[PDB]
Amino acid sequence: KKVFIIDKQTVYQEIDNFSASDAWRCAFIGKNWPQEKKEKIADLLFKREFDEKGNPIGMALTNWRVNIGAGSYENREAKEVDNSWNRTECFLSPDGKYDFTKQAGQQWFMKAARERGMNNFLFFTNSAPYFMTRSASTVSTDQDCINLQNDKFDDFARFLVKSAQHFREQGFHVNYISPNNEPNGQWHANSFQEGSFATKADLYRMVEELDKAISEAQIDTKILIPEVGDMKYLFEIDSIAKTPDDIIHSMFYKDGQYSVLKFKNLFNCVAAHDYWSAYPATLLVDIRNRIHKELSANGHNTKFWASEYCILEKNEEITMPASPERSINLGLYVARIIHNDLTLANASAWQWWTAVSLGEDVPIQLLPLEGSNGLSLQYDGEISTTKMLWTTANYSFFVRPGMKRIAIKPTYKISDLEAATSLMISSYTDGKEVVTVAINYSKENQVISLNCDHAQKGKVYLTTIDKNLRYMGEQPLKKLQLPARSVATIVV
Numbered sequence: 001k002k003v004f005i006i007d008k009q010t011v012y013q014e015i016d017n018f019s020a021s022d023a024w025r026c027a028f029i030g031k032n033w034p035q036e037k038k039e040k041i042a043d044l045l046f047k048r049e050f051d052e053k054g055n056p057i058g059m060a061l062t063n064w065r066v067n068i069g070a071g072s073y074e075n076r077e078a079k080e081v082d083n084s085w086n087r088t089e090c091f092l093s094p095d096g097k098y099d100f101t102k103q104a105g106q107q108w109f110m111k112a113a114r115e116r117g118m119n120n121f122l123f124f125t126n127s128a129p130y131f132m133t134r135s136a137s138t139v140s141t142d143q144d145c146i147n148l149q150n151d152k153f154d155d156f157a158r159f160l161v162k163s164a165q166h167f168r169e170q171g172f173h174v175n176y177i178s179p180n181n182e183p184n185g186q187w188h189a190n191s192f193q194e195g196s197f198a199t200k201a202d203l204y205r206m207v208e209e210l211d212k213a214i215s216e217a218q219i220d221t222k223i224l225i226p227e228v229g230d231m232k233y234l235f236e237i238d239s240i241a242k243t244p245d246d247i248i249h250s251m252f253y254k255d256g257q258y259s260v261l262k263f264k265n266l267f268n269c270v271a272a273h274d275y276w277s278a279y280p281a282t283l284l285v286d287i288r289n290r291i292h293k294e295l296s297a298n299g300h301n302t303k304f305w306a307s308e309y310c311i312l313e314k315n316e317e318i319t320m321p322a323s324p325e326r327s328i329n330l331g332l333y334v335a336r337i338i339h340n341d342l343t344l345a346n347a348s349a350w351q352w353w354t355a356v357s358l359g360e361d362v363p364i365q366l367l368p369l370e371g372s373n374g375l376s377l378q379y380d381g382e383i384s385t386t387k388m389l390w391t392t393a394n395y396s397f398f399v400r401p402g403m404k405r406i407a408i409k410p411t412y413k414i415s416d417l418e419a420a421t422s423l424m425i426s427s428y429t430d431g432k433e434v435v436t437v438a439i440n441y442s443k444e445n446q447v448i449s450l451n452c453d454h455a456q457k458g459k460v461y462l463t464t465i466d467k468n469l470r471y472m473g474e475q476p477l478k479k480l481q482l483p484a485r486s487v488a489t490i491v492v
Contacts, residue, residue, distance in 0.1 A: 007406060013404065017063035044057070050471070055471045068125050070126060070129050072087045072137070075137060091103070121167070132155055145201070184229050215265060223265055226272070233245045234270065289345075306337075317329060330387060332387075390463040391463050436490040440483060458480075
Protein backbone atom coordinates (compact mmCIF):
# COMPACT_ATOMS: atom_id res chain seq x y z
CA LYS A 1 0.00 0.00 0.00
CA LYS A 2 1.28 3.44 -1.05
CA VAL A 3 0.82 6.78 0.74
CA PHE A 4 0.52 10.19 -0.90
CA ILE A 5 0.65 13.55 0.81
CA ILE A 6 -1.03 16.51 -0.83
CA ASP A 7 0.66 19.85 -0.18
CA LYS A 8 -1.60 22.90 -0.71
CA GLN A 9 1.40 25.16 -0.03
CA THR A 10 3.42 23.99 -3.04
CA VAL A 11 1.66 25.46 -6.08
CA TYR A 12 2.47 24.97 -9.79
CA GLN A 13 0.72 26.24 -12.99
CA GLU A 14 -2.76 27.73 -13.33
CA ILE A 15 -5.20 25.64 -15.44
CA ASP A 16 -6.65 27.41 -18.49
CA ASN A 17 -8.83 24.69 -20.13
CA PHE A 18 -9.31 21.33 -21.72
CA SER A 19 -10.34 21.59 -25.29
CA ALA A 20 -11.06 19.92 -28.61
CA SER A 21 -11.48 20.98 -32.21
CA ASP A 22 -14.50 21.49 -34.52
CA ALA A 23 -12.44 20.76 -37.65
CA TRP A 24 -13.90 19.14 -40.79
CA ARG A 25 -16.85 17.19 -39.33
CA CYS A 26 -18.75 19.61 -37.12
CA ALA A 27 -19.69 21.67 -40.17
CA PHE A 28 -21.71 18.62 -41.31
CA ILE A 29 -23.06 17.56 -37.95
CA GLY A 30 -24.12 21.04 -36.92
CA LYS A 31 -25.88 21.65 -40.20
CA ASN A 32 -27.32 18.26 -41.16
CA TRP A 33 -27.53 15.79 -38.30
CA PRO A 34 -30.84 15.16 -36.41
CA GLN A 35 -31.43 17.70 -33.61
CA GLU A 36 -31.38 15.13 -30.83
CA LYS A 37 -28.06 13.69 -31.98
CA LYS A 38 -26.44 17.18 -32.38
CA GLU A 39 -27.64 17.99 -28.84
CA LYS A 40 -26.35 14.75 -27.42
CA ILE A 41 -22.85 15.38 -28.92
CA ALA A 42 -22.96 18.93 -27.48
CA ASP A 43 -23.85 17.51 -24.05
CA LEU A 44 -20.91 14.97 -24.16
CA LEU A 45 -18.54 17.84 -25.04
CA PHE A 46 -19.62 20.83 -22.94
CA LYS A 47 -22.27 20.17 -20.31
CA ARG A 48 -20.94 20.08 -16.76
CA GLU A 49 -23.71 18.04 -15.05
CA PHE A 50 -24.29 14.70 -13.41
CA ASP A 51 -26.91 12.22 -14.55
CA GLU A 52 -29.60 10.77 -12.22
CA LYS A 53 -27.15 8.39 -10.50
CA GLY A 54 -24.36 10.97 -9.88
CA ASN A 55 -22.20 10.20 -12.96
CA PRO A 56 -20.58 13.02 -14.99
CA ILE A 57 -22.36 13.27 -18.34
CA GLY A 58 -19.30 14.12 -20.46
CA MET A 59 -15.94 15.87 -20.75
CA ALA A 60 -17.39 19.33 -19.93
CA LEU A 61 -14.62 20.94 -22.02
CA THR A 62 -13.76 24.49 -21.14
CA ASN A 63 -12.35 25.79 -24.43
CA TRP A 64 -13.49 24.98 -28.02
CA ARG A 65 -11.25 25.33 -31.06
CA VAL A 66 -13.00 26.74 -34.16
CA ASN A 67 -11.45 26.25 -37.64
CA ILE A 68 -11.83 29.53 -39.48
CA GLY A 69 -12.06 28.45 -43.11
CA ALA A 70 -9.73 29.47 -45.92
CA GLY A 71 -12.24 28.75 -48.68
CA SER A 72 -10.99 25.54 -50.19
CA TYR A 73 -14.72 24.86 -50.66
CA GLU A 74 -15.45 27.97 -52.81
CA ASN A 75 -12.12 27.34 -54.63
CA ARG A 76 -12.68 23.63 -55.08
CA GLU A 77 -12.43 23.60 -58.94
CA ALA A 78 -8.75 24.64 -58.48
CA LYS A 79 -5.92 22.32 -57.35
CA GLU A 80 -7.48 22.24 -53.89
CA VAL A 81 -8.33 19.96 -50.95
CA ASP A 82 -9.21 16.67 -52.66
CA ASN A 83 -12.25 15.60 -50.62
CA SER A 84 -15.54 16.99 -49.39
CA TRP A 85 -15.06 16.41 -45.65
CA ASN A 86 -11.99 18.63 -45.27
CA ARG A 87 -12.89 21.64 -47.43
CA THR A 88 -13.87 24.88 -45.66
CA GLU A 89 -15.87 27.92 -46.61
CA CYS A 90 -14.37 31.40 -46.15
CA PHE A 91 -16.20 34.40 -44.67
CA LEU A 92 -14.18 36.66 -46.99
CA SER A 93 -14.33 36.57 -50.76
CA PRO A 94 -11.80 37.77 -53.38
CA ASP A 95 -13.83 40.98 -53.89
CA GLY A 96 -13.27 41.83 -50.20
CA LYS A 97 -16.90 41.28 -49.10
CA TYR A 98 -17.81 39.33 -45.95
CA ASP A 99 -20.45 36.64 -45.70
CA PHE A 100 -20.91 35.62 -42.07
CA THR A 101 -23.71 33.14 -42.89
CA LYS A 102 -21.07 30.61 -43.97
CA GLN A 103 -19.57 27.97 -41.59
CA ALA A 104 -23.19 27.45 -40.31
CA GLY A 105 -22.63 23.98 -38.86
CA GLN A 106 -19.67 25.25 -36.84
CA GLN A 107 -21.67 28.28 -35.66
CA TRP A 108 -24.36 25.87 -34.41
CA PHE A 109 -21.65 24.20 -32.25
CA MET A 110 -20.57 27.60 -30.85
CA LYS A 111 -24.18 28.33 -29.92
CA ALA A 112 -24.64 24.85 -28.35
CA ALA A 113 -21.48 25.26 -26.26
CA ARG A 114 -22.51 28.70 -24.96
CA GLU A 115 -26.00 27.31 -24.17
CA ARG A 116 -24.28 24.75 -21.96
CA GLY A 117 -22.27 27.40 -20.10
CA MET A 118 -19.03 27.18 -22.10
CA ASN A 119 -18.20 30.54 -23.68
CA ASN A 120 -14.47 30.39 -24.35
CA PHE A 121 -13.34 30.08 -27.93
CA LEU A 122 -10.08 29.86 -29.91
CA PHE A 123 -10.14 30.63 -33.66
CA PHE A 124 -7.53 28.79 -35.74
CA THR A 125 -6.53 28.68 -39.41
CA ASN A 126 -4.85 26.02 -41.51
CA SER A 127 -4.35 28.41 -44.40
CA ALA A 128 -4.85 32.04 -45.31
CA PRO A 129 -7.80 32.58 -47.67
CA TYR A 130 -7.06 30.96 -51.04
CA PHE A 131 -6.93 34.31 -52.88
CA MET A 132 -4.19 35.69 -50.55
CA THR A 133 -1.88 32.72 -51.05
CA ARG A 134 1.14 32.27 -53.36
CA SER A 135 -0.36 29.12 -54.95
CA ALA A 136 -3.88 30.57 -55.36
CA SER A 137 -5.05 27.65 -53.21
CA THR A 138 -5.15 26.43 -49.60
CA VAL A 139 -2.92 23.65 -50.96
CA SER A 140 0.56 25.20 -51.11
CA THR A 141 3.02 24.20 -53.86
CA ASP A 142 6.42 24.60 -52.13
CA GLN A 143 8.26 24.59 -48.84
CA ASP A 144 10.12 27.96 -49.27
CA CYS A 145 8.15 29.95 -46.71
CA ILE A 146 4.50 30.63 -45.81
CA ASN A 147 1.98 30.16 -48.61
CA LEU A 148 0.90 33.81 -48.19
CA GLN A 149 1.78 36.78 -50.33
CA ASN A 150 4.41 39.17 -48.95
CA ASP A 151 2.10 42.12 -48.58
CA LYS A 152 -0.84 40.11 -47.16
CA PHE A 153 0.31 39.52 -43.57
CA ASP A 154 -1.67 42.61 -42.63
CA ASP A 155 -4.70 41.60 -44.79
CA PHE A 156 -4.70 38.14 -43.23
CA ALA A 157 -4.31 39.51 -39.67
CA ARG A 158 -7.16 41.90 -40.39
CA PHE A 159 -9.34 39.02 -41.68
CA LEU A 160 -8.68 36.96 -38.50
CA VAL A 161 -9.35 39.96 -36.23
CA LYS A 162 -12.55 41.02 -38.04
CA SER A 163 -13.88 37.40 -37.78
CA ALA A 164 -13.13 37.25 -34.04
CA GLN A 165 -14.67 40.69 -33.58
CA HIS A 166 -17.80 39.65 -35.48
CA PHE A 167 -18.32 36.71 -33.15
CA ARG A 168 -17.53 38.84 -30.06
CA GLU A 169 -20.30 41.24 -31.17
CA GLN A 170 -22.60 38.18 -31.26
CA GLY A 171 -21.76 37.33 -27.65
CA PHE A 172 -19.05 34.71 -28.19
CA HIS A 173 -15.81 35.15 -26.11
CA VAL A 174 -13.26 34.47 -28.80
CA ASN A 175 -10.26 34.90 -26.55
CA TYR A 176 -7.46 33.48 -28.75
CA ILE A 177 -6.36 33.47 -32.40
CA SER A 178 -3.98 30.86 -33.71
CA PRO A 179 -2.82 31.96 -37.21
CA ASN A 180 -0.53 29.04 -38.10
CA ASN A 181 -0.76 25.27 -37.75
CA GLU A 182 2.18 22.88 -37.73
CA PRO A 183 4.40 25.38 -39.65
CA ASN A 184 7.24 22.79 -39.54
CA GLY A 185 5.22 20.56 -41.86
CA GLN A 186 5.79 19.85 -45.52
CA TRP A 187 2.22 20.77 -46.43
CA HIS A 188 2.79 21.08 -50.20
CA ALA A 189 3.03 17.26 -50.35
CA ASN A 190 -0.56 16.94 -48.97
CA SER A 191 -3.85 17.77 -50.69
CA PHE A 192 -6.03 15.91 -48.14
CA GLN A 193 -6.25 19.10 -46.12
CA GLU A 194 -5.56 22.87 -45.92
CA GLY A 195 -2.04 23.75 -44.76
CA SER A 196 1.13 25.79 -44.91
CA PHE A 197 4.78 25.50 -43.95
CA ALA A 198 6.06 28.67 -42.31
CA THR A 199 9.39 30.01 -41.04
CA LYS A 200 10.02 31.82 -37.75
CA ALA A 201 10.31 35.02 -39.81
CA ASP A 202 6.80 34.27 -41.14
CA LEU A 203 5.51 33.54 -37.65
CA TYR A 204 7.04 36.73 -36.26
CA ARG A 205 5.34 38.83 -38.93
CA MET A 206 1.97 37.21 -38.30
CA VAL A 207 2.36 37.98 -34.60
CA GLU A 208 3.42 41.55 -35.38
CA GLU A 209 0.50 42.16 -37.76
CA LEU A 210 -2.10 40.45 -35.51
CA ASP A 211 -0.81 42.50 -32.57
CA LYS A 212 -1.39 45.71 -34.52
CA ALA A 213 -4.80 44.60 -35.85
CA ILE A 214 -6.04 43.57 -32.34
CA SER A 215 -5.00 46.99 -30.96
CA GLU A 216 -6.85 48.83 -33.73
CA ALA A 217 -9.97 46.69 -33.16
CA GLN A 218 -9.60 46.90 -29.34
CA ILE A 219 -10.85 43.33 -28.87
CA ASP A 220 -9.97 41.33 -25.75
CA THR A 221 -8.18 38.61 -27.76
CA LYS A 222 -4.65 37.18 -27.69
CA ILE A 223 -2.30 35.55 -30.19
CA LEU A 224 -1.20 31.92 -29.81
CA ILE A 225 1.75 30.31 -31.61
CA PRO A 226 3.42 28.18 -32.93
CA GLU A 227 1.32 24.96 -33.00
CA VAL A 228 4.35 22.90 -34.06
CA GLY A 229 3.45 19.33 -35.07
CA ASP A 230 6.17 17.76 -32.92
CA MET A 231 7.49 19.10 -29.59
CA LYS A 232 11.07 18.60 -30.95
CA TYR A 233 10.71 21.82 -32.96
CA LEU A 234 10.58 23.68 -29.64
CA PHE A 235 14.38 23.18 -29.51
CA GLU A 236 17.05 23.44 -32.26
CA ILE A 237 17.18 20.24 -34.37
CA ASP A 238 18.94 20.91 -37.72
CA SER A 239 21.20 23.30 -39.74
CA ILE A 240 18.45 24.40 -42.12
CA ALA A 241 17.88 28.17 -41.88
CA LYS A 242 14.22 28.03 -42.90
CA THR A 243 13.17 25.43 -40.27
CA PRO A 244 10.79 26.79 -37.57
CA ASP A 245 12.68 24.88 -34.90
CA ASP A 246 14.30 26.41 -31.82
CA ILE A 247 10.93 28.00 -30.95
CA ILE A 248 11.52 28.45 -27.23
CA HIS A 249 14.87 30.30 -27.38
CA SER A 250 14.41 32.10 -30.66
CA MET A 251 10.81 33.29 -30.02
CA PHE A 252 10.20 33.12 -26.26
CA TYR A 253 13.49 34.48 -24.83
CA LYS A 254 13.92 38.23 -24.73
CA ASP A 255 17.13 38.15 -26.74
CA GLY A 256 15.91 35.57 -29.28
CA GLN A 257 16.26 36.41 -32.98
CA TYR A 258 12.52 36.38 -33.44
CA SER A 259 11.47 37.22 -29.90
CA VAL A 260 7.72 37.95 -29.74
CA LEU A 261 7.64 38.63 -25.98
CA LYS A 262 7.38 42.40 -26.57
CA PHE A 263 4.04 42.21 -28.38
CA LYS A 264 1.23 43.49 -26.13
CA ASN A 265 -1.43 41.17 -27.59
CA LEU A 266 0.63 37.98 -27.52
CA PHE A 267 -0.77 35.24 -25.38
CA ASN A 268 2.23 34.50 -23.17
CA CYS A 269 2.24 30.79 -23.87
CA VAL A 270 3.87 28.36 -26.30
CA ALA A 271 1.60 25.85 -28.12
CA ALA A 272 2.82 22.52 -29.42
CA HIS A 273 1.25 19.16 -30.33
CA ASP A 274 1.81 15.81 -28.59
CA TYR A 275 2.30 13.91 -31.85
CA TRP A 276 5.30 11.48 -32.16
CA SER A 277 6.48 11.99 -28.61
CA ALA A 278 3.99 9.91 -26.59
CA TYR A 279 5.93 6.63 -26.97
CA PRO A 280 8.18 5.18 -25.75
CA ALA A 281 8.02 6.30 -22.12
CA THR A 282 11.64 7.49 -22.10
CA LEU A 283 10.88 9.95 -24.91
CA LEU A 284 7.51 10.86 -23.33
CA VAL A 285 9.03 12.03 -20.05
CA ASP A 286 12.40 13.47 -21.26
CA ILE A 287 11.01 15.78 -23.95
CA ARG A 288 8.29 17.14 -21.62
CA ASN A 289 10.78 17.74 -18.79
CA ARG A 290 12.94 19.58 -21.30
CA ILE A 291 10.03 21.89 -22.21
CA HIS A 292 9.56 22.99 -18.62
CA LYS A 293 13.34 23.30 -17.98
CA GLU A 294 13.96 25.55 -21.03
CA LEU A 295 10.67 27.44 -20.94
CA SER A 296 10.69 28.26 -17.23
CA ALA A 297 14.23 29.76 -17.39
CA ASN A 298 12.97 32.48 -19.83
CA GLY A 299 12.26 34.76 -16.84
CA HIS A 300 8.81 35.59 -18.19
CA ASN A 301 6.40 33.10 -16.59
CA THR A 302 5.44 31.80 -20.05
CA LYS A 303 2.75 29.13 -20.12
CA PHE A 304 2.71 25.91 -22.12
CA TRP A 305 -0.37 24.49 -23.98
CA ALA A 306 -0.54 21.02 -25.50
CA SER A 307 -2.80 22.16 -28.33
CA GLU A 308 -3.50 19.14 -30.57
CA TYR A 309 -3.45 15.37 -30.35
CA CYS A 310 -5.16 12.24 -31.69
CA ILE A 311 -4.10 8.56 -32.02
CA LEU A 312 -1.94 8.62 -35.11
CA GLU A 313 1.07 6.54 -34.16
CA LYS A 314 1.39 2.78 -34.04
CA ASN A 315 2.96 0.66 -31.31
CA GLU A 316 2.43 -2.54 -29.27
CA GLU A 317 0.42 -0.72 -26.58
CA ILE A 318 -2.38 0.54 -28.84
CA THR A 319 -2.12 -1.27 -32.21
CA MET A 320 -4.52 -4.19 -32.08
CA PRO A 321 -7.76 -5.44 -33.52
CA ALA A 322 -10.76 -3.63 -32.00
CA SER A 323 -11.69 -4.98 -28.58
CA PRO A 324 -12.77 -3.79 -25.09
CA GLU A 325 -9.07 -4.25 -24.16
CA ARG A 326 -7.92 -2.09 -27.06
CA SER A 327 -10.55 0.47 -26.02
CA ILE A 328 -9.30 0.98 -22.44
CA ASN A 329 -5.66 0.74 -23.66
CA LEU A 330 -6.29 3.80 -25.84
CA GLY A 331 -8.02 5.59 -22.96
CA LEU A 332 -5.07 4.96 -20.59
CA TYR A 333 -2.43 5.72 -23.29
CA VAL A 334 -3.91 9.19 -23.75
CA ALA A 335 -4.53 9.74 -20.04
CA ARG A 336 -0.74 9.18 -19.67
CA ILE A 337 -0.01 11.90 -22.21
CA ILE A 338 -2.32 14.17 -20.24
CA HIS A 339 -0.71 13.45 -16.87
CA ASN A 340 2.83 14.04 -18.15
CA ASP A 341 1.84 17.22 -19.99
CA LEU A 342 0.29 18.60 -16.79
CA THR A 343 2.99 17.39 -14.38
CA LEU A 344 6.21 17.39 -16.42
CA ALA A 345 5.62 20.09 -19.06
CA ASN A 346 3.43 21.99 -16.55
CA ALA A 347 0.90 22.58 -19.33
CA SER A 348 -1.89 25.05 -18.64
CA ALA A 349 -4.19 23.42 -21.24
CA TRP A 350 -4.56 20.04 -22.98
CA GLN A 351 -6.44 20.01 -26.32
CA TRP A 352 -7.76 17.24 -28.57
CA TRP A 353 -7.76 17.41 -32.33
CA THR A 354 -11.27 16.72 -33.78
CA ALA A 355 -13.84 15.86 -31.03
CA VAL A 356 -15.44 13.37 -33.50
CA SER A 357 -13.92 10.90 -35.92
CA LEU A 358 -14.82 7.85 -37.96
CA GLY A 359 -11.93 5.99 -36.27
CA GLU A 360 -11.24 5.12 -32.63
CA ASP A 361 -8.69 7.92 -32.16
CA VAL A 362 -10.53 10.75 -30.32
CA PRO A 363 -13.41 11.08 -27.71
CA ILE A 364 -16.36 10.40 -30.05
CA GLN A 365 -16.49 7.82 -32.81
CA LEU A 366 -19.19 8.28 -35.44
CA LEU A 367 -20.61 5.00 -36.81
CA PRO A 368 -22.48 4.85 -40.11
CA LEU A 369 -26.12 3.76 -39.72
CA GLU A 370 -26.33 0.09 -40.66
CA GLY A 371 -25.40 -0.79 -44.22
CA SER A 372 -24.29 2.81 -44.91
CA ASN A 373 -20.92 4.13 -46.04
CA GLY A 374 -18.58 6.74 -44.42
CA LEU A 375 -19.87 9.54 -46.67
CA SER A 376 -23.35 9.00 -45.27
CA LEU A 377 -21.96 10.38 -41.95
CA GLN A 378 -22.17 13.85 -43.55
CA TYR A 379 -25.95 13.53 -42.95
CA ASP A 380 -26.65 11.18 -39.99
CA GLY A 381 -24.92 8.43 -37.98
CA GLU A 382 -24.51 6.74 -34.59
CA ILE A 383 -22.59 8.30 -31.67
CA SER A 384 -20.12 6.01 -29.85
CA THR A 385 -18.05 7.28 -26.87
CA THR A 386 -14.49 5.99 -26.61
CA LYS A 387 -12.61 5.35 -23.37
CA MET A 388 -10.50 8.36 -24.43
CA LEU A 389 -13.55 10.50 -23.86
CA TRP A 390 -13.95 9.17 -20.33
CA THR A 391 -10.26 9.28 -19.35
CA THR A 392 -10.09 12.91 -20.57
CA ALA A 393 -13.20 13.58 -18.49
CA ASN A 394 -11.41 12.30 -15.35
CA TYR A 395 -9.42 15.48 -15.82
CA SER A 396 -11.60 17.90 -17.79
CA PHE A 397 -14.88 17.48 -15.86
CA PHE A 398 -13.21 18.11 -12.45
CA VAL A 399 -10.08 20.23 -13.25
CA ARG A 400 -11.71 23.61 -13.96
CA PRO A 401 -10.32 26.95 -15.32
CA GLY A 402 -8.49 28.87 -12.60
CA MET A 403 -7.52 25.86 -10.48
CA LYS A 404 -3.87 25.46 -9.73
CA ARG A 405 -1.87 22.28 -9.81
CA ILE A 406 -0.44 21.59 -6.32
CA ALA A 407 2.09 19.09 -4.97
CA ILE A 408 1.23 15.45 -4.26
CA LYS A 409 4.29 13.40 -3.32
CA PRO A 410 4.54 9.77 -2.35
CA THR A 411 6.43 8.73 0.81
CA TYR A 412 8.65 6.60 -1.44
CA LYS A 413 10.23 8.48 -4.38
CA ILE A 414 9.48 7.14 -7.89
CA SER A 415 11.10 8.33 -11.14
CA ASP A 416 9.10 10.07 -13.89
CA LEU A 417 10.02 7.06 -16.03
CA GLU A 418 8.88 4.44 -13.54
CA ALA A 419 5.62 6.23 -12.86
CA ALA A 420 4.84 6.13 -16.61
CA THR A 421 4.40 2.32 -16.57
CA SER A 422 2.94 1.99 -13.08
CA LEU A 423 1.11 4.75 -11.19
CA MET A 424 0.62 8.45 -12.13
CA ILE A 425 -1.12 10.90 -9.87
CA SER A 426 -1.53 14.69 -9.72
CA SER A 427 -3.66 17.18 -7.77
CA TYR A 428 -5.35 20.53 -8.44
CA THR A 429 -7.36 22.97 -6.37
CA ASP A 430 -9.47 26.10 -6.38
CA GLY A 431 -9.24 26.40 -2.59
CA LYS A 432 -12.71 24.81 -2.15
CA GLU A 433 -12.21 21.37 -3.77
CA VAL A 434 -9.07 19.30 -4.05
CA VAL A 435 -9.11 17.11 -7.18
CA THR A 436 -6.74 14.17 -7.55
CA VAL A 437 -6.43 12.03 -10.67
CA ALA A 438 -4.68 8.70 -10.39
CA ILE A 439 -3.75 6.48 -13.30
CA ASN A 440 -3.15 2.83 -12.55
CA TYR A 441 -1.19 1.82 -15.64
CA SER A 442 -0.09 -1.51 -14.17
CA LYS A 443 -1.89 -4.86 -14.42
CA GLU A 444 -2.22 -5.05 -10.63
CA ASN A 445 -4.85 -3.48 -8.38
CA GLN A 446 -3.18 -0.99 -6.06
CA VAL A 447 -4.26 0.49 -2.71
CA ILE A 448 -3.30 4.03 -1.73
CA SER A 449 -3.61 6.44 1.18
CA LEU A 450 -4.43 10.02 0.36
CA ASN A 451 -3.29 12.53 2.95
CA CYS A 452 -5.01 15.84 2.35
CA ASP A 453 -4.97 18.23 5.35
CA HIS A 454 -7.45 16.72 7.81
CA ALA A 455 -9.88 15.24 5.30
CA GLN A 456 -11.18 11.70 5.77
CA LYS A 457 -13.28 11.15 2.61
CA GLY A 458 -13.64 11.92 -1.10
CA LYS A 459 -15.99 11.14 -3.97
CA VAL A 460 -14.53 8.66 -6.39
CA TYR A 461 -15.14 8.54 -10.16
CA LEU A 462 -13.73 5.61 -12.09
CA THR A 463 -12.93 4.69 -15.72
CA THR A 464 -11.97 1.11 -16.56
CA ILE A 465 -12.53 -1.48 -19.29
CA ASP A 466 -16.09 -1.75 -17.83
CA LYS A 467 -16.76 1.80 -16.54
CA ASN A 468 -17.24 5.21 -18.19
CA LEU A 469 -16.33 7.63 -15.36
CA ARG A 470 -18.73 5.95 -12.95
CA TYR A 471 -19.44 7.54 -9.62
CA MET A 472 -18.28 5.19 -6.84
CA GLY A 473 -19.61 6.99 -3.75
CA GLU A 474 -17.72 8.68 -0.91
CA GLN A 475 -14.61 6.69 -0.09
CA PRO A 476 -12.22 6.70 2.87
CA LEU A 477 -9.03 8.51 1.80
CA LYS A 478 -6.77 6.25 3.92
CA LYS A 479 -7.77 3.22 1.80
CA LEU A 480 -8.53 3.98 -1.85
CA GLN A 481 -8.72 0.95 -4.12
CA LEU A 482 -7.23 1.57 -7.58
CA PRO A 483 -8.20 -1.17 -10.06
CA ALA A 484 -5.52 -2.35 -12.49
CA ARG A 485 -5.71 -0.46 -15.80
CA SER A 486 -7.91 2.40 -14.51
CA VAL A 487 -8.17 6.15 -14.08
CA ALA A 488 -9.71 7.45 -10.82
CA THR A 489 -10.66 10.97 -9.92
CA ILE A 490 -10.90 11.68 -6.20
CA VAL A 491 -12.68 14.88 -5.15
CA VAL A 492 -12.27 16.23 -1.60
